[PDB]
DNA sequence: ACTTGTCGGTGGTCTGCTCTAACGTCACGGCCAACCGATCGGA
DNA sequence: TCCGATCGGTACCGGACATGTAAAGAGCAGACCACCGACAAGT
């Protein structure tokens, strides 16, 4: 069948972000990143786990400033 | 050297439940498709096809 | 005036495509019966469903007054 | 008003809520993941911080 | 500055550019320009400086920026400014030897070493 | 309406929806350091 | 059209006698205001009376960019012009200097606020003279006409043609749907 | 002597404003078509 | 009390993209630019 792992792989550190709100494109074709959704949020509340939620939220969409000093440190 | 002792998070969706986002220890592989743990498969409701 | 080609598809702009058939109900008229559950009672309708023209439904209520619905007054 | 507006209806509350002049205060869970704040449970409340 | 900077510095400038520089660009850019008073005494001396190199017989060429651009700029073509080839050297001793023995007219002698020096920056 | 009829998109329309500003791009977001692939059974690993 | 010349006459006398002028006689200055508000009630209830020929006008050009609504107060714009400008010696009827003063307004109303990136009118009527002349060629050869034969027929650089071309583009929106559903966006 | 700034002029293109006199006078191109529950304004 | 009508809602990932017409034409003016004169004062 026509659905080969060659297609399917994707992964990214940092690639091209959009222009209004400054998050991560999609799509394998523009190296995007991978949707957090409102689902994996609830997951991660009933977890516990509120500095990987914060990270995920902030550091690595949005924070324009986190961005670049994240890749620093 | 890096990925040793440094935990990844894998998830499947939908993510029903909080069992649909689980730590992992990685290890390199030679192929493109990522090898999982036969028996996580009932929490990610998972199956290889 | 493009044209098909004795394969069954049309060459636009260099790609082949192919047009779909659509699977649509026929104008005509249209009987149709309901069961109402505030009262109990068969209540009859038919619709008249032309191709680009209006729509003329008559229906049979509780009062038992037939009613006539010139386009969608 | 901002939970209430990501949830759903968002005109009606945002019309209600500036009418009555609301102010919210800023603690719960979807306020926190909106605004970027911890959440208040798990390892962010203020005992295991 | 000096009136001999300004002008080395266009004909260093223009010679450089890719696209045709507009006279706006040149006074902010080119060194010399940007001591002028008003815009109209920047203007005159651009014209005359222009009138200078043309007299000259640098190549300036006067142009549209591009296709989808009104403004207007200069250039000069560096494969019209000059003839690189030289030919045999023996032939060209004997014509500078002879370049000027006796003549007095000052157009025709500043021409001679005009030629004689040109002759000299293309070898020999 | 616009070219090919279609309704103009007002700041309410930002606003609202599942592809509103609030539920897609507050409630949840696209990230870095992220990949995916398909997944095929490993026997051999540990539960860790 | 006299009601409205003798109010402008009088008020405008009136004007002169307020300032460096004389004492009116109240009688006098009774009718000069008067006449000055019958001339104003002259001139609403010709352009009021006249406010259908616009409609009519502004019928032609729906469907071009601008909405039907702004091409009717803009026609009315053209009629108060008209209503300005009409003479009543001549003997012509309102209709024809009305028709022209409408058309020119509504015609240069869509030239100015019809695009997102605004084209000068000089501009916009080489663009619709190129247009036509193209659909002329298009009949006339039986194929599409090049840019060569747009030249010829145009008196014109076979260059400043495709300029012409480029300034026609109108931009496309970002917030056009992509997919078959509604989860996309250009 | 050469330069230089203020003065004045010719010619050209891009941009905006005004005007044109037989008579003309009250818009369309088109669905909507699920199906549920809640609720305000009528009857 | 019954009554139509508007208004709210309807799981997730992956991917996939950009429109199709114009009834024109002229006369007049300000602005900026590319080419030039003088001209005395300054170099």
């Not at chain 7, 003479?87 to 309102?94: A, C, L, Q, S």
């Given at each position: 069948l026509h659905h080969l792992v060659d297609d399917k792989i994707h992964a990214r550190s940092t690639g091209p972000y959009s222009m209004i709100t400054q998050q991560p494109l999609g799509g394998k074709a523009q190296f995007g990143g991978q949707r957090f959704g409102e689902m994996e949020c609830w997951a991660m509340q009933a977890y516990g786990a509120a500095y990987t939620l914060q990270e995920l939220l902030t550091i690595k969409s949005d924070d324009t400033v986190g961005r670049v000093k994240v890749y620093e440190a | 050297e890096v990925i040793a002792e440094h935990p990844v998070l894998l998830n499947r969706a939908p993510?029903?439940?909080?069992?649909?986002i689980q730590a992992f220890e990685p290890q390199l592989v030679e192929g493109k498709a990522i090898q999982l743990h036969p028996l996580v498969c009932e929490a990610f409701n998972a199956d290889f096809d | 005036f493009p044209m098909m080609t004795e394969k069954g598809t049309f060459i636009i702009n260099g790609t082949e495509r192919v047009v779909v058939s659509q699977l649509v109900r026929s104008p005509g008229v249209y009987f149709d019966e309901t069961i109402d559950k505030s009262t109990e009672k068969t209540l009859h309708s038919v619709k008249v469903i032309p191709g680009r023209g209006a729509w003329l439904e008559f229906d049979v209520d509780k009062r038992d007054t037939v009613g006539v619905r010139i386009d969608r007054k | 008003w901002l939970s209430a507006a990501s949830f759903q209806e968002t005109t009606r509350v945002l019309t209600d809520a500036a009418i009555n002049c609301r102010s919210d205060k800023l603690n719960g869970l979807k306020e926190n993941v909106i605004i970027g704040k911890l959440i208040p449970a798990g390892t962010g409340i203020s005992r295991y911080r | 500055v000096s009136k001999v900077e300004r002008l080395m510095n266009l004909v260093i400038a223009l010679l450089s550019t890719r696209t045709y520089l507009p006279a706006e660009k040149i006074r902010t850019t080119?060194?010399?320009?940007?001591?002028?008073?008003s815009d109209e005494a920047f203007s005159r001396m651009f014209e005359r400086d222009k009138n200078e190199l043309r007299d000259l017989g640098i190549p300036l060429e006067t142009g549209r920026v591009?296709?989808?651009?009104s403004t207007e700029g200069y250039r000069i073509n560096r494969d019209s400014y000059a003839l690189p080839p030289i030919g045999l050297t023996a032939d060209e001793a004997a014509a500078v030897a002879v370049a000027t023995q006796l003549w007095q007219s000052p157009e025709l002698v500043t021409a001679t070493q005009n030629a004689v020096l040109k002759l000299r920056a293309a070898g020999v | 309406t616009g070219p090919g009829n279609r309704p103009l998109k007002s700041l309410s329309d930002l606003l609202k929806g599942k592809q509103g500003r609030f539920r897609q791009n507050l409630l949840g977001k696209r990230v870095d350091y992220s990949g995916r692939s398909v997944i095929v059974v490993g026997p051999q690993l540990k539960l860790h | 059209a006299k009601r409205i010349e003798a109010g402008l006459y009088a008020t405008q006398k009136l004007a002169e006698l307020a300032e460096k002028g004389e004492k009116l006689p109240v009688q006098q200055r009774r009718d000069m205001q008067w006449i000055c508000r019958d001339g104003d009630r002259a001139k609403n209830h010709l352009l009021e009376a006249n406010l259908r020929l616009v409609v009519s006008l502004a019928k032609r050009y729906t469907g071009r960019g601008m909405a039907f609504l702004d091409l009717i107060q803009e026609g009315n714009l053209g009629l108060i012009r008209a209503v300005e400008k009409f003479?009543?010696?001549?003997?012509?009827?309102?209709s024809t200097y009305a028709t022209w003063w409408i058309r020119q307004a509504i015609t240069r109303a869509m030239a100015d606020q019809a695009r997102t990136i605004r084209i000068p009118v000089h501009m916009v009527e080489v663009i619709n003279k190129l247009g036509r002349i193209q659909r002329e060629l298009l009949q006339d050869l039986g194929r599409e006409p090049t840019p060569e034969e747009l030249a010829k027929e145009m008196d014109?650089?076979?260059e400043k043609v495709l300029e012409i071309q480029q300034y026609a583009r109108e931009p496309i929106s970002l917030d056009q749907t992509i997919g078959d559903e509604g989860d996309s966006q250009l």
């Open positions: - | 993510t029903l439940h909080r069992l649909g | - | - | 080119v060194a010399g320009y940007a001591d002028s008073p591009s296709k989808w651009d | - | 003479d009543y010696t001549k003997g012509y009827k309102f014109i650089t076979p």
